[PDB]
């Protein structure tokens, strides 16, 4: 800054990754340091509410109500705007079972059915399955034996 003090972005923050060591500067506040990058297993995903509207890497606009779902074996890169709500393991589904679910908000499910709030539906698919950010896990439902 013209005063000779370093200029500051104030309310804005600053994420960092791997680089050569750097001096801290006056007026800075180190909220965070030294942590392995957010690793994630293939059969689990990150649930991520926006704090405020922001640009996406793909050019997509992001509403504050939007819920990101980062699935797959990887290491997610945090944004100062992105907030980490939680983590959800994918639900395994053994043969002859169905994954009961509920709609916490109006939307479309992977089945493609229109989903009014409070609606419930089966998940026919066998094997591991990841619930959607609106989808809520309940229980596996075994098929009744029929001799």
């Amino acid at each position: 800054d013209i005063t000779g003090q370093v200029r500051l972005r104030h309310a804005d923050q600053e994420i960092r990754l791997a680089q050569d060591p750097f001096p801290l500067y006056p007026g800075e506040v180190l909220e965070k340091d030294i942590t392995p990058l957010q690793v994630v297993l293939p059969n689990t995903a990150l649930h991520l509410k926006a704090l405020l509207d922001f640009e996406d890497k793909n050019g997509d606009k992001v509403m504050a109500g939007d819920e990101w779902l980062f699935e797959g074996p990887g290491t997610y890169i945090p944004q100062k705007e992105v907030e980490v709500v939680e983590i959800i393991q994918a639900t395994v589904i053994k043969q002859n079972q169905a994954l009961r679910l509920r709609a916490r908000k109006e939307c479309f499910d992977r089945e493609g059915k229109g989903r009014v709030t409070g609606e419930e539906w089966l998940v026919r698919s066998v094997g591991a399955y990841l619930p959607a950010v609106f989808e809520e896990v309940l229980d596996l439902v075994d098929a009744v034996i029929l001799t």
């Binding site: 005063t3 801290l24 007026g27």
Partner: peptide, 22 residues
């Protein structure tokens, strides 16, 4: 004291009172 030996991977936030800035 007036003498300040800075180690190669180290830093200090000096506060100049004349310009009233760090």
């Amino acid at each position: 004291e007036a003498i300040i030996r800075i180690p190669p991977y180290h830093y200090i936030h000096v506060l100049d009172q004349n310009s009233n800035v760090s």
